[PDB]
Amino acid sequence: YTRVVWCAVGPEEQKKCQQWSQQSGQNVTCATASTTDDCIVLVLKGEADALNLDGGYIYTAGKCGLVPVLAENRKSSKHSSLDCVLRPTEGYLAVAVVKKANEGLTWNSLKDKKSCHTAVDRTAGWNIPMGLIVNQTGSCAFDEFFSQSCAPGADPKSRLCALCAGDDQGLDKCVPNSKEKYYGYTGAFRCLAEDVGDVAFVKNDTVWENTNGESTADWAKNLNREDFRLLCLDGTRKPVTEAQSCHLAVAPNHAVVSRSDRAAHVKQVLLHQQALFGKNGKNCPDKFCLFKSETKNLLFNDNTECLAKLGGRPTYEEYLGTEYVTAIANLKKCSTSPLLEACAFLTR
Amino acid sequence: YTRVVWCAVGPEEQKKCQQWSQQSGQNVTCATASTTDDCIVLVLKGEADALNLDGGYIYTAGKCGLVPVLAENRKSSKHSSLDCVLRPTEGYLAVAVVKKANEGLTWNSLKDKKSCHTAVDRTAGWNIPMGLIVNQTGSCAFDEFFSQSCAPGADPKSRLCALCAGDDQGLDKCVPNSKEKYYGYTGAFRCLAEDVGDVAFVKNDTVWENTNGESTADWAKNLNREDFRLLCLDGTRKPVTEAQSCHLAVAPNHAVVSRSDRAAHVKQVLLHQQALFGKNGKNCPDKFCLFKSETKNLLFNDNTECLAKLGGRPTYEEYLGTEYVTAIANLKKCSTSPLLEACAFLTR
Ligand SMILES: *[C@@H]1O[C@H](CO)[C@@H](O[C@@H]2O[C@H](CO)[C@@H](O[C@@H]3O[C@H](CO)[C@@H](O)[C@H](O)[C@@H]3O)[C@H](O)[C@H]2NC(C)=O)[C@H](O)[C@H]1NC(C)=O
Ligand SMILES: *[C@@H]1O[C@H](CO)[C@@H](O[C@@H]2O[C@H](CO)[C@@H](O[C@@H]3O[C@H](CO)[C@@H](O)[C@H](O)[C@@H]3O)[C@H](O)[C@H]2NC(C)=O)[C@H](O)[C@H]1NC(C)=O
Ligand SMILES: *[C@@H]1O[C@H](CO)[C@@H](O[C@@H]2O[C@H](CO)[C@@H](O[C@@H]3O[C@H](CO)[C@@H](O)[C@H](O)[C@@H]3O)[C@H](O)[C@H]2NC(C)=O)[C@H](O)[C@H]1NC(C)=O
Ligand SMILES: *[C@@H]1O[C@H](CO)[C@@H](O[C@@H]2O[C@H](CO)[C@@H](O[C@@H]3O[C@H](CO)[C@@H](O)[C@H](O)[C@@H]3O)[C@H](O)[C@H]2NC(C)=O)[C@H](O)[C@H]1NC(C)=O
Ligand SMILES: *[C@@H]1O[C@H](CO)[C@@H](O)[C@H](O)[C@H]1NC(C)=O
Ligand SMILES: *[C@@H]1O[C@H](CO)[C@@H](O)[C@H](O)[C@H]1NC(C)=O
Ligand SMILES: [Fe+3]
Ligand SMILES: [Fe+3]
């Protein structure tokens, strides 16, 4: 079996996948599922081979025995002659975002506000913010800390999914895939920009990438950077330019995960695949571009220069980092998770 | 060893072979095996010398180091003046064939349909259709694409062998030799003519050759040309008369293969052998006709005028054509093969 079966989450990621298969000549093929946890189960079960996960989902995959393969790398500030595949990975900035018009909304005034999230169990939209909120309150009532939220993945009949809009017919409310209007980085931002929520937990890069006409989709083009403000742990409301000291935490990059037995092969294929269809690649933009999806961060983030290597075969722990592992572990004492609990025997 | 040891597949091909031996005065003799792969292994091992293979089987033979010797060549409409052994080869038309009666079955609704095939790994019955289906779906789960199939050679306990009937006691279900009821071109057709399947992947010529009493065997004689029809890649359902732009792909002719050292010998013996017992032959029909097989396409196709030479020194690649070689290679990224793996190994 020399093909690598990519798991796509939802029809958008699935149609991109379909193309990737065709252009790579079935070097890559596609399994599909509604949610990322379903895909993690597909990879567990041998019906798929690999997928690109947010660090939060990498915690779950690693609890189920999967390992990381290749990290994402995005344009750096240091500017290095070292090649993208060899350049050290940077992290990204998890930040809270508000409309500047809503004054008097600081860190310490978030209770009973409407919040927007990428999805449940992701790093910027959930793990870091909710972990911090639980730490301060001394309470596991993250479910009742906000009046309403949109957090795809949560209990669909809960208040954490009250704000999620579904697709366009309004169906599949709060499924954690891009079919949902407010899924993901982009979706949490949109959720804020149409003021369905008061704060959005995203990354630094989302704010710039969707403001000042960088996205010429409906909601986004008209958006404006100065109308938005980064809440800090201190209690301030700084502008987006001040992200380097107004960030909630530093988040490990979305990385590819696979089973151990299939790791080295998947890496191989992917290293070559990005040569063919990556940023500066032979068939990019002729036949297919792997890291470009028309602003929907499909399969990978759109701002991915390339997939960088890692040192050795790292575990999910080494990759994510002892301290982020602990922050996650602690947030998860507040909440049992089916996939996590079914797998919990693998690490005892 | 001036004898050419022909490999026969099944007792049916074996008993025709036997006669061919006797009349040719042991200029040719017979080895036997259950399947075509087994015969290719006999040629590898020096235990046989040559046999006539479908283009798909020629790819496998070529991965194991065998070379083509003489193509089959069929009654043409054009050129027709250069003698048969010197006439350029034309290819053949791989087509999908359905009962006309079954409306609402085009190309794009073949999922969950019942399929009939010549055998696994052949050009018209397997490689071209499945290759396209895998390309369309972006998925290597071709085994689960059709509800049931008959594809001799597949895992006999699988669903791709569910429909195959065996011989007459029903034994040897789904072995890819003519003793199984739905093996080969003819066998795929019949699988349709008795509606055990909904589509059959065969060549143009099979359709005419079994309809309108062109065959006076049981199932075939009563057939009508217009009760069967050809699905197109566009999605149409045009007549068999319309084969020329409702063809799935162009198929390289069934060719004889041998080991590389024995090629030039086998050629001469065969060119002389067809002079003796061929279409236009001194001992045909008197004592033996090499290209007539009791309507069972034994050893060679029945519509074979003769064996034509090949241009230059061809590899299995050159003969089949750079593009169909790739169509095969990709479909085989979805499936490991024992003989191919042993040959990817031992010859290197
Ligand atoms: C699909 O995946 C295959 C498998 O990796 C890719 O084919 C491989 O790519 C190149 C193109 O010929 C070959 O690599 C080179 O081989 C030669 C030795 O002859 C040498 O320059 C280097 O050692 C280098 O590795 C390799 O032979 C080839 N593999 C096969 C089996 O042909 C292919 O590029 C991928 N295509 C797409 C569209 O994804
Ligand atoms: C927060 O996210 C934004 C958006 O990704 C980051 O800004 C981006 O930073 C890179 C590197 O600093 C910029 O590239 C630089 O731009 C100049 C063009 O003047 C170019 O010559 C250099 O080669 C260099 O790559 C990039 O333009 C910029 N993106 C946008 C949309 O402005 C920012 O660095 C992040 N902030 C923190 C604190 O990490
Ligand atoms: C089996 O194969 C051998 C070939 O190796 C056949 O032997 C050949 O038999 C013919 C006579 O039938 C000989 O032909 C000669 O041709 C010239 C014309 O250029 C003529 O002048 C001679 O008088 C003679 O007719 C030929 O020499 C001979 N070849 C060998 C190598 O001995 C044999 O007939 C084949 N038998 C069957 C049943 O296939
Ligand atoms: C699809 O397959 C059918 C059957 O294999 C092809 O029809 C056959 O075509 C040959 C050559 O065109 C015909 O031979 C002709 O016979 C007549 C005598 O009646 C003669 O006038 C011509 O000189 C030529 O020799 C043959 O009769 C015909 N067979 C049948 C049963 O109709 C057809 O050409 C194939 N079409 C495509 C597009 O591949
Ligand atoms: C089949 O794959 C080819 C490349 O091998 C691609 O160009 C084509 O688009 C694929 N088929 C379809 C229906 O897209
Ligand atoms: C809160 O602070 C940090 C989380 O940022 C954590 O290390 C610490 O254990 C927590 N303690 C309490 C009492 O919440
Ligand atoms: Fe993330
Ligand atoms: Fe064939």
DSSP structure class, residue B172:
S
Q: Whole-angstrom Cα distance, residue A198 to residue A207?
A: 15
Which residue type sits at B162? Answer: A
* Local structure of residue B141 (DSSP, 8 states): -
Task: Extract the annotated binding site of B.
Answer: 54, 92, 118, 122, 124-125, 185, 254
- Rounded to whole angstroms, the Cα distance separating B103 from A183 reads 42
Cβ < 5 A residues, ion ligand 7: A 54, 123
- In the structure, how many helices (H) and strands (E) does chain B have? 11, 13
Q: Which residue is associated with the tokens 């235990």?
A: B47
Closest CA to A69 of A6, A12, A1: A6
Pairing of strands B50-53, B255-258: antiparallel
Phi, psi of A154, deg, nearest 5 = -65, 170
B114, B79 Cβ separation under 8 angstroms: no
Are the CB atoms for A256 and A11 separated by under 8 Å?
A: no
Q: Which amino acid is at A175?
A: V
Rounded Cα distance, A29 and A293, in Å: 18
Three-state helix/strand/coil letters over chain A: CCCEEEEEEHHHHHHHHHHHHHHCCCCEEEEEECCHHHHHHHHHCCCCCEEEECHHHHHHHHHCCCEEEEEEEECCCCCCCCCCCCCCCCCEEEEEEEECCCCCCCHHHCCCCCEEECCCCCHHHHHHHHHHHHHHHCCCCCCCCCCCEECCCCCCCCHHHCCCCCCCCCCCCCCCCCCCCCCHHHHHHHHHHCCCCCEEEEEHHHHHHHCCCCCCCHHHHCCCHHHEEEECCCCCEEEHHHCCCCCCEEECCCEEEECCCCHHHHHHHHHHHHHHHCCCCCCCCCCCCCCCCCCCCCCCCCCEEEEECCCCCCCHHHHHCHHHHHHHHHHHCCCCCHHHHHHHHHHC
Contact predicate A267/A70, CB 8 Å: yes
Question: Which bound ligand lies closest to the C-alpha atom of A24?
Answer: 1
Q: Which two tokens stand for residue B230?
A: 């050809």
Does the beta-carbon distance from A29 to B331 stay under 8 Å? Answer: no
Place of tokens 């409409």: B77
Pairing assessment for the beta strands A255-258 and A67-74 based on DSSP bridges: antiparallel
Runs of H (alpha helix) within B142-224:
184-193, 204-210, 218-221
What interhelical angle do B55-63 and B322-331 show, nearest 10? 80
Tokens describing residue B270? 């065969």
Dist. CA A298–CA A15, nearest whole Å: 10
User: Which residue's CA lies nearest to atom 5 of ligand 4?
Assistant: B205
Q: How far is A200 from A116, CA to CA, in rounded Å? A: 4
Instruction: Give residue A119 CA to ligand 4 midpoint distance, Å.
Output: 64
- Six token digits for residue A197: 């929520």
Would you call B22 helix, strand, or coil by DSSP? helix
**CA A272 – ligand 1 centroid, Å:** 9
Nearest-angstrom CA–CA distance, B294 and B286: 15
Q: Which residues of chain A have a CB within 8 Å of the CB of B134?
A: 26, 29
Largest CA distance in chain B: 58
Residues of A with CB under 8 A from a CB of B: 1-3, 5, 17-22, 25-27, 29-31
Q: CA A89: distance to chain centroid?
A: 16
Evaluate whether B165 touches B133 at the Cβ level (below 8 Å): no
Contact B251, B55 (CB under 8 A): yes
Q: What is the dihedral of CA A171, A176, A180, A186, to 10 degrees?
A: 170
Farthest CA pair distance, chain A? 58
Distance from CA of A33 to the nearest CA of B (A): 13
The pairing of beta strand A304-308 with beta strand B28-33: unpaired
Distance CA A52, CA A256 (A): 4
Q: What dihedral angle (degrees, nearest 10) is formed by the CA atoms of A51, A52, A53, A58?
A: 70
- Residue A133 CB neighbours (<10 A): 19
Ligand 3 pocket at CB < 6 A: B 24-25, 27, 276
CA distance B338 to B345: 11
User: Determination technique for this PDB entry?
Assistant: X-ray
Rounded Cα distance between B250 and A251, Å, is 54
Residue of B139, B142, B144, B322 for testing the chain A interface, max A β-carbons within 10 Å = B139
Tell the residue nearest (CA) to atom 2 of ligand 5: A22
Phi, psi for residue A52 in degrees, rounded to 5: -95, 125
Candidates A43, A48, A45; CA nearest to B140 is A48
Q: Which of B110, B132, B133, B135 to mutate to test the pocket of ligand 5 (most atoms within 8 A of CB)?
A: B135
Question: Identity (one letter) of the amino acid at A147?
Answer: S
Q: Is B92 helix (H, G, I), strand (E, B) or coil?
A: strand
* Ramachandran angles phi, psi of A279, nearest 5°: -45, -65
CA of B297 from ligand 8 middle (Å) equals: 11
Give the angle B293-B296-B299 at the CA atoms, nearest 5°: 60
Compute the Cα dihedral for A298, A303, A308, A310 and give only its sign: negative
Contacts of B11 (CB under 8 A, 6+ apart): B32, B179
- Which are the contacts of A230, defined by CB distance < 8 A and separation ≥ 6? A95, A96, A97, A207, A237, A238, A239, A240, A242, A243, A246, A247
Q: Rg of the Cα trace of chain B?
A: 19
For B249, the token pair is 């792909």
A5, A11, A12, A14: CA torsion to nearest 10: 10
Q: What is the resolution of this structure in A?
A: 2.6
